[PDB]
């Protein structure tokens, strides 16, 4: 199972790890993708997860979008996890660089509650522009299921653990 995680609360754990490498080692039931409404996995966690699937995640996502249209900001969809997990929960956090509403971050984390255990990144963090300390706070105050957070950046990981209330 998951190893080397620091327990923050009854149900939230955190580790300084590359979510792609973490997904391949563990092969969780669910890996969370930091998706956009179009499921266009270009950069950040999305580009990295997609590149690990040899673009199979993007091909599957384009078929999903052609059939269903785009997701909502704060929404999600369950697709295959390919070589990384049983499933991939594509969650759309607000992108503050695209002027999207930060209040939608709680709605985005609510999607995690439909899954008993997940390997995930901090939503709206990184290239999405939100404050990662705020994202971790929303995560522990919203998610009730078991979440194993993978934080790529070592200096951000230290700042998050050392500042956690
Ligand atoms: C094998 N690793 C990767 O391909 C990789 C992983 C990342 C994970 C999170 C992130 F936000 C960025 C990452 N970037 C990359 C290139």
Swiss-Prot record:
Name of the gene: rep
What catalytic activity does the UniProt entry give for this protein? Thiol-dependent hydrolysis of ester, thioester, amide, peptide and isopeptide bonds formed by the C-terminal Gly of ubiquitin (a 76-residue protein attached to proteins as an intracellular targeting signal)
Q: Could you describe the subunit structure of this protein?
A: May form homohexamers. Interacts with N protein.
Known regulation of its activity is: Inhibited in vitro by GRL-0617.
> In what way does this protein cross or attach to the membrane?
Multi-pass membrane protein
Q: Where is the protein localized?
A: Host endoplasmic reticulum membrane
Relate the outcome reported for changing residue 162 to L: In strain: Gamma/P.1
Name the UniProt record assigns to this protein: Papain-like protease nsp3
Superkingdom, taxonomy of origin: Viruses
| Role summary | Responsible for the cleavages located at the N-terminus of the replicase polyprotein. Participates together with nsp4 in the assembly of virally-induced cytoplasmic double-membrane vesicles necessary for viral replication. Antagonizes innate immune induction of type I interferon by blocking the phosphorylation, dimerization and subsequent nuclear translocation of host IRF3. Also prevents host NF-kappa-B signaling. In addition, PL-PRO possesses a deubiquitinating/deISGylating activity and processes both 'Lys-48'- and 'Lys-63'-linked polyubiquitin chains from cellular substrates.
Query: Signal peptide span per the entry?
Result: none
> Ranges for the Macro domain?
1-165
Complete protein: which residues are present? 1027 to 1191 of 7096
């Amino acid at each position: 199972s998951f190893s080397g995680y620091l327990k923050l609360t009854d149900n939230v754990y955190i580790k300084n790890a590359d979510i792609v490498e973490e997904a391949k080692k563990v092969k969780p039931t669910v890996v969370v993708n930091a998706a956009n409404v179009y499921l266009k996995h270009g950069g950040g966690v999305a580009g990295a997860l997609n590149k690990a699937t040899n673009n199979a995640m993007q091909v599957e996502s384009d078929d999903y979008i052609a059939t269903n249209g785009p997701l909502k900001v704060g929404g999600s969809c369950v697709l295959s996890g390919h070589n990384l997990a049983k499933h991939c929960l594509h969650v759309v956090g607000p992108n503050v660089n695209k002027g999207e509403d930060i209040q939608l971050l709680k709605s985005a984390y609510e999607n995690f509650n439909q899954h008993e255990v997940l390997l995930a990144p901090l939503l709206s963090a990184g290239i999405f522009g939100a404050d990662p300390i705020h994202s971790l706070r929303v995560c522990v105050d919203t998610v009730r299921t078991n979440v194993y957070l993978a934080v790529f950046d070592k200096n951000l990981y230290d700042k998050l653990v050392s500042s956690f209330l």
